[PDB]
Amino acid sequence: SNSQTSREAIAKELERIKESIVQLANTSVNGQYLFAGSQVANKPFDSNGNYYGDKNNINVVTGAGTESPYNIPGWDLFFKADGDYKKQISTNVSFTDNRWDLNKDPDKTKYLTGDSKWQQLIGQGYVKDNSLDADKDFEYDDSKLDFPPTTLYVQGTKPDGTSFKSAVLVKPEDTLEDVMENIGALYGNTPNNKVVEVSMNDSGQIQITDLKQGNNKLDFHAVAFTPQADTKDELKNIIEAANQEGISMNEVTNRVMQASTAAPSNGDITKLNNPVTVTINNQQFTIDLKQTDFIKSKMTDTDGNAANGADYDNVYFEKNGNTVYGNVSQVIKGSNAYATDSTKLSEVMAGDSLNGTTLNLKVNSKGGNSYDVTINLQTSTVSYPDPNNPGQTISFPIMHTNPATGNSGVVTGSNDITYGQINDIIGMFAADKIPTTTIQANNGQINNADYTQIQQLMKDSQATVDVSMDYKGRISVTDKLSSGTNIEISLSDSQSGQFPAPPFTTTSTVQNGPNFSFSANNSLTIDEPNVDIIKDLDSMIDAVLKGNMRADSESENPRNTGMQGALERLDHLADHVSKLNTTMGAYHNTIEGVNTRTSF
Amino acid sequence: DLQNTGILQDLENYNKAWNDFASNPNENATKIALVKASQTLTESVNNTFA
Amino acid sequence: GDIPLVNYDRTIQPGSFDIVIYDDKGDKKLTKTITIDVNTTMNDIMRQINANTDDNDNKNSNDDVDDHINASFSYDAKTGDGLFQINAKSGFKVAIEDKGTNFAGAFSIGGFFSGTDASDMKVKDSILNDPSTVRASSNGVDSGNDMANKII
């Protein structure tokens, strides 16, 4: 009986309890703050704040060279990597049979299972007349038809961390079991050894849980495309149209999609969404195309289009005040903490040299206008052509310091280039009187004065804007000369654009080559080693308020995440704190023994 | 051994931490507490030497 | 600066001290070090200090600790005496990591004491005025308790 307002009234006390924890989190012994790291008077938190304390321990010397630590710094609870726990990745979409329509049948709302053969939910999906007979066309096969397949892209992080670009088809009568066997092949979730578990969840979605302890950077996004006839009547025609042509329905699925890209105006390589007219038995027909977003929402892409499902990284940084960040974090190959400036490209890439490695950038600048750039770090090369005359171009190879002298100017080695230079690059997208360059890599040698002048403009640029690698690893930027940022960013890779090997079939096509990730329309999850109060509590409050067991994309919060997700997040947190709880007494009883024998 | 000297007791409870470690190795603190008891043990060998 | 290090002090031994430029906690794309033996002179020390003693070598320059450095003059012949300054920009924090070099603190280059024996040995008065200058912190503003502990 909890009306919405009822759920807030319940939530209010939790909100009080939330601050109760914040108060507790801010606790001190008369200024000896329990959370300060090593420095007593550090008041560590607020309702909306970060950890405010050192990370050394409060320590006292009693030794021939001995300290004595007796606390825990606040972060080590507040944002601590409780590395035992694993990713909970789920589809925001939910699935059902669709011969019935569930607006016809909202009370019914039956979810897919192994029995749910693929024909059934495409049943009405084939058509606009939406009148197909559930049994006699599909199951009471006295009058059943021929049927074509469906298409799917997939992108995700293999639990080890490797990248892959893949495409695959779905056959007309497929079931859950067909999906699972290919899933085992696709992820290496082998029968001999699994790496993640697959489930259909409490709310009707499809969920996967990771077996890898402390895996923070498991992510997923997928898109499926399908053709659509108009009429139940039209479909039977394609049997005869196709089969007397000598082909089942399945060939027809192939024709429309390729033609769309053949002139991308007919549906681009990635934005494939055009309805098309085609020939079967060289009878003329027109057909509609389906779009499927396994992260679907109230989305308009970075381009400003009503975002087409291919819009994964076609989303900007996520906005919070003067701060914007790519929620798709950059995370350590290990503890899964986050990046540092001097990290060369060598530490990052998958390859001996940055072969064919190249990147693209999108920037809606602080000056309003958008400035988008492409970079081949394989040659340490950055670029920009002139709008009026792109023939003229701006040349810059990446640069560095000397060993002992101002004897300067031979270009960086490709693999060596580091993260700090990235944040430096954002410094260039700063303001108003912005810079430009031109250089020749004379045996790599160049004029440092050009670099030095660039450096000086950068050292003045210090004040403009911030780049940060946050406590979630999210690729973060803050508008310093603002409390609300007039800036937006989006990035992508260009070994993408090159795809798995065609012709694409029901057997998965899988290729490698894209080497980095960016801000994108990522999977949904709240649980992982590292904690964060605001995301964990406030996101889960929203779901209770809306009553959404987990989520709703159309809900103002398109990433409403909680309620059912809270269960194991509680499983995580009970352990997370208990570890911290038992830790302190170990000091206390340890110190007792030392003091006691010292006393004696 | 007024108070059976720390080393021999460090070992003792350390070995108590062992049977605790058998209780739950997934409870990492069993390691840490176990490790600590030896830490007193070893450093106590070290100080006696000095 | 002519005088060699050991000749000016017989505690000087083969040692090194590193310099990582810091916010109250620090960084590693900007870091200098100075090297010592039982023979070298301050002039050499100043050369490692006051030069393009790089810390991010790949055959170019700039983008180092040197960003934080500065120097100045202030003297008057009306006195016949004056002040000469060697500094890094305050607003940055600093740390200095020594291994067996033993010179600067002894000669109170930033040391605690002035005077050499109980006739003149004394606390530096700035410390007498403000014990807050006794920040327990090696690393930052007061971002460390250690020094309080270390002197135990």
Numbering used by the authors:
A (entry chain F): 101 to 700
B (entry chain O): 103 to 152
C (entry chain V): 356 to 507
List sentences from the manuscript:
Specifically, we exploited a C. jejuni ∆flhG minicell strain with additional deletions of the flagellin genes flaA and flaB34. In these minicells, flagella consist of only the basal body, the hook, the HFJ and the FliD cap. Particles were then subjected to several rounds of two dimensional (2D) classification. This allowed us to produce a map of the FliD cap of C. jejuni assembled on the HFJ to an overall resolution of 6.5 Å with 15,077 particles, and the atomic model of the cap–HFJ complex was built. In this structure, the cap complex also consists of a FliD pentamer with an overall width of ~130 Å and a length of ~180 Å—dimensions that are comparable to the cap structure bound to the filament. Like our previous observations, the HFJ of C. jejuni shows a two-layer structure, with the proximal layer comprising 11 FlgK subunits and the distal layer comprising 11 FlgL subunits. Notably, the C. jejuni FliD orthologue includes an additional domain, D4, not present in S. enterica. Most FliD monomers adopt an angle of 89–95° between the D0–D1 and D2–D3 axes, which is larger compared with the angles of 81–84° measured from the filament-bound FliD. When the two cap complex structures are superimposed, it can be seen that their structures are highly similar. However, the D2–D3 plane of the C. jejuni cap is flat compared with the tilted plane of the S. enterica cap (Fig. 6h(i–iii)) while the D0 and D1 helices are well aligned (Fig. 6h(iv)). In contrast to the filament-bound cap structure, one of the FliD monomers (FliD 3) is positioned downwards, and its D2–D3 domains are flipped, probably corresponding to a major conformational change from initiation to elongation. Interestingly, there is a gap between FliD 3 and FliD 4 in the cap bound to the HFJ, corresponding to the position of FliC incorporation in the structure of the cap bound to the filament.
